[PDB]
């Protein structure tokens, strides 16, 4: 009972690349059918961490539920949530990954944020997020109002502090900036905490899953 990915990569599918939402949703599958060289993946360029490990974790699943870990319109009262890009276009229209939110400043401010989530799903929860590395200082100031930014992510099984490095990368899909993608599996009962003062590409949707 295989999961057909079509023109998408696991990266495209799991992040919610706009071209990848046309695929039929599944709650279980024995293996993953995926084109050798898939067209749509990370529509916004960046490094996807532990990618091979993640494909293996997702290889076979007995239960799969997408849920809104951090509701878009509720979680972020003092930040702007509408961020979109032509690099992630859908129907000729600038857009973004279904499963992440591009947070930016609001009314001249990007207030320190702290958002936590407790896994009460009784199944492992796959959580994904990103860290944005602007191509220059102008974009850094315009988006986040802060030049010295950090993103911090913590649970019982994950602990990292990220800092953007602002500089040009080779132009890919019309971007010289980058987004690095990260993920963790959260134990039942464990809590994960995100803190940032800029540059967080927040989780919007997460995945409760079983593998056997």
């Amino acid at each position, epitope marked *: 009972a295989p999961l057909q990915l079509g023109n998408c990569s696991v990266a495209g599918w799991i992040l919610g690349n706009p071209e990848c939402e046309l695929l039929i949703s599944r709650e279980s599958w024995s293996y993953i059918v995926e084109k050798p060289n898939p067209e749509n993946g990370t529509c916004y360029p960046g490094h996807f961490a532990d990618y091979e490990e993640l494909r293996e974790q997702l290889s076979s699943v007995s239960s799969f539920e997408r849920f809104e870990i951090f509701p878009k319109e509720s979680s972020w009262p003092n930040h702007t949530t509408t961020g979109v890009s032509a690099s992630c276009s859908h129907n000729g229209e600038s857009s973004f990954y279904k499963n992440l939110l591009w947070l930016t400043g609001k009314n001249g401010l990007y207030p320190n944020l702290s958002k936590s989530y407790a896994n009460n799903k009784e199944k492992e929860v796959l959580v994904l997020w990103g860290v944005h590395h602007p191509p220059n200082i102008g974009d850094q100031r*315009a988006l986040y*109002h802060t030049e010295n930014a950090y993103v911090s992510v913590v649970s019982s099984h994950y602990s990292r502090k990220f800092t953007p490095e602002i500089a040009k990368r080779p132009k890919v899909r019309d971007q010289e900036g980058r987004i690095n993608y990260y993920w963790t599996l959260l134990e039942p009962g464990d809590t994960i905490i995100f803190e940032a003062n800029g540059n967080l590409i927040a989780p919007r949707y997460a995945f409760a899953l079983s593998r056997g």
Partner: antibody
Amino acid sequence: QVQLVQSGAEVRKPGASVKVSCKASGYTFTDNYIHWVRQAPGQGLEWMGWIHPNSGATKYAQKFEGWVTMTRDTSISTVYMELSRSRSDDTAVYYCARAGLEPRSVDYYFYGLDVWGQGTAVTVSS
Amino acid sequence: QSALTQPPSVSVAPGQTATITCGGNNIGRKRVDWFQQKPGQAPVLVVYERFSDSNSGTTATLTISRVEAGDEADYYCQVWDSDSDHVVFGGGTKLTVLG
């Protein structure tokens, strides 16, 4: 509705301070950047910098950095532009403009200048 | 002379179509704000069936269809330069409606 009203024309001697004010109304003052742009007689428009009334953060054009100071008073919805050491160079009309045109993408994340003040004529002579 | 390049002057008879071009680095991938300035007045942001906008590579174009007397003005293009965090204005185009 939304408008910016600036103070009146000024004549100053060089080396003196020139302070121009801009009062905003018709909207929430703390929402938007306020820019200053100037126009010398017979010439075009040159950006001087902005101030955000909410944070008080400022940014000046390289050419004006160190010569100009922008401030805000939220209680009276007014921003100021000040030339601390004025020169004959500084004779021009000065505008304030509200940056209320919201950007549609993070690819080009710049708020556009949608509402301008009427301008203040500043003359600097000894 | 200016970071953005505009033709110094355009003259057009009423009813005709006026076209104003703006040249600049990566202009085609940005929003180019146009400003209309009439004599003795402050600039106003040009907002928009007559007035339309169109970019391409290093060229942004403001098109005014069926020109009227109230269209006569100086027009300035403007963008934000990402790298130096700096607002830049074109040198302006004096648009005359031949009356």
